[PDB]
């Protein structure tokens, strides 16, 4: 369940890179390449696409979340002011069509309150990382799995992580 072998108190948790968000998958658009050609899509992490997603709780408001995350782990406010690019390349096989689409990835951070080996409260922060492309080869009129286009729940395309540090009182 939400059971964890830790003492009572609050913790900052780094849940890892490679998280993608639900519903958001195709909003950047995608490319259609055909017959031997190569498609390259990329992006540039600055300013207003690097603005993170907060999800506070009665105990853990946004400022509390930001300060504790930036103290223990990476300071995303300083980092995301400096443009970083990323690109992906796909090559269409001969006489076939390929569709590739792009979505951002995030580092997932958590603030958890633990009481009697149990997580009773959890705040979440998603900080924009880089990106991820999915591609498929298709025929005209071929039905495509809904799962390829649309993600119902947040998932990590990598191995999830759990890197914790106990937060001490003011």
């Amino acid at each position: 369940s939400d059971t964890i072998d830790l003492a009572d108190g609050n913790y900052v948790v780094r849940r890892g890179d490679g998280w993608i968000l639900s519903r958001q998958n195709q909003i950047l658009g995608g490319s259609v390449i055909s017959n031997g050609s190569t498609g390259i899509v990329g992006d540039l992490r600055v300013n207003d696409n690097a603005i993170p997603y907060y999800y506070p709780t009665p105990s853990f408001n946004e400022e509390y979340i930001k300060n504790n995350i930036q103290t223990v782990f990476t300071n995303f406010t300083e980092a995301n002011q400096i443009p970083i690019g990323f690109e992906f390349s796909k090559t269409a096989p001969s006489n076939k069509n390929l569709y590739m689409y792009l979505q951002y990835t995030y580092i997932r951070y958590e603030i958890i309150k633990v009481l009697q080996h149990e997580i009773i409260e959890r705040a979440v922060l998603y900080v924009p990382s880089l990106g991820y492309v999915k591609s498929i080869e298709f025929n005209p009129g071929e039905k495509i799995n809904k799962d390829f286009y649309f993600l119902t729940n947040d998932k990590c395309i990598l191995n999830e992580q759990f890197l914790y540090k106990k937060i001490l009182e003011t």
Partner: protein
């Protein structure tokens, strides 16, 4: 030969796919003639971030571009419409043998915003969000064939991307969203506040323990609908409390739109999910309450469906009841009482059937004990469509028919309850 759209009343945003281009080369970026062995590239470097979305509406005053964009944000969380920082680039190396052409087109992802009401679209908007391009390569043109004249095509789009139809319901922004801040356990009674009088509204609530719940208003009036917030409960969490993530993307579960119809909901709710109840416009000034009850007994067999309470069954003969048909593999239920005095001996012949939609039905005998409602399965695998089979039931007894739609031929489902003797 139109498809039947068994959608509940409300707003839907539909991603109709990527790689749409306009007709008559209106979105042609250009062509590169690449000699054999050489390479060529066409690049969108985003030195300017400006993009040009396309928009058409059937109703400028409700489905404006602003409104439509807010709906696309509600559904898919799109936030950039005019702009883009996403680069795209096409590269082609021509083989050693022959020359090669590459044509690059700007593309659009097509979104349709519909207002669906009682079996048809009453408002419709198309939003073409600027996408990441289309690149077709062809062999080099030969001299000269000959140029044959052609009239221009009609205005419109052509899809070059893969087939896609992603349908996402969205919360109607004109209606209030009330919240139940405490997670629901075994029982809960929500009093309908005067702050939202007469107008339809939503109730956002979550549940403590995954289980099956009966939900209804006083005397099962009005009929309610229940939705699931898509992707809810994946993030912030507080034990025994509701965490609102402002998710307006909703999956219809069950519920009728006809508000004068008595009914209740029996649904499986996850503790790691948020749910919306929509209570409709009520034409009465009387105070009402929404009742939540966790079902531990036989009523669990009715999930997930709305149960229609049928009251006017007090004479013999033919009776019919029309409702919105559930989609294929979805359920609808009916609770009815055989007319006459219950004396445990007097019986009537009952014929249950549908008119157009095929459905598999199971019949339950209902008896209420001091332990709750008991359901005795007395008939299974009833094929309802034009069913001629009949069964003898007890006068004054209470029965529930649970129907699974298997063939959707009509927007409505028409249940007939013919009684003789």
């Amino acid at each position: 030969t139109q498809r039947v759209l068994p959608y509940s009343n409300g707003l839907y945003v539909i991603n109709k796919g990527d790689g749409y281009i306009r007709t008559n080369d209106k979105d042609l970026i250009g062509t590169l003639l690449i000699e054999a062995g050489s390479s060529g590239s066409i690049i969108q470097p985003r030195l300017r971030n400006t993009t040009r979305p396309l928009f058409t509406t059937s109703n400028d005053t409700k489905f404006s571009q602003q409104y439509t964009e807010e709906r696309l944000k509600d559904a898919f969380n799109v936030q950039l419409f005019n702009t883009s920082t996403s680069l795209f680039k096409f590269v082609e190396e021509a083989p050693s043998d022959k020359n090669i052409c590459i044509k690059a087109y700007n593309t659009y992802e097509k979104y349709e915003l519909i207002d669906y009401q009682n079996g048809s679209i009453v408002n419709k908007a198309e939003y073409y969000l600027p996408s990441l391009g289309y690149c077709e390569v062809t062999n080099a043109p030969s001299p000269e064939s000959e140029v044959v004249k052609m009239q221009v095509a009609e205005d419109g789009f052509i899809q070059n991307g893969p087939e896609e139809e992603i349908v996402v319901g969205v919360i109607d922004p004109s209606e209030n969203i009330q919240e139940i801040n405490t997670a629901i356990s075994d029982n809960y009674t929500y009093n309908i506040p005067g702050i939202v009088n007469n107008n339809p509204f939503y109730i956002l609530f979550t549940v403590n323990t995954t289980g099956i719940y009966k939900i209804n208003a006083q005397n099962n009036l009005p009929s309610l609908k229940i939705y699931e917030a898509i992707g809810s409960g994946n993030r912030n969490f507080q034990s025994g409390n509701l965490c609102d993530d402002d998710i307006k993307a909703i999956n219809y579960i069950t519920g009728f739109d006809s508000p004068n119809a008595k009914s209740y909901l029996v649904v499986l709710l996850n503790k790691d999910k948020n749910y919306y109840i929509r209570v409709p416009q009520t034409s009465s000034n009387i105070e009402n309450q929404i009742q939540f009850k966790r079902e531990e007994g036989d009523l669990r067999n009715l999930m997930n469906s709305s149960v229609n309470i049928i009251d006017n069954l007090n004479s013999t003969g033919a009776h019919y009841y029309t409702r919105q048909s559930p989609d294929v593999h979805d359920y609808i239920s009916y609770e009815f009482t055989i007319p006459g005095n219950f004396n445990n001996k007097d019986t009537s012949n009952i014929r249950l059937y549908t008119s157009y939609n095929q459905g598999i039905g199971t019949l339950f005998r209902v008896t209420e004990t001091i332990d709750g409602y008991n359901l005795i399965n007395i008939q299974q695998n009833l094929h309802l469509l034009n069913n001629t089979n009949s069964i003898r039931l007890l006068n004054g007894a209470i029965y529930i028919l649970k129907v699974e739609v298997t063939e959707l031929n009509n927007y409505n489902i028409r249940l007939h309850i013919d009684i003789t003797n």
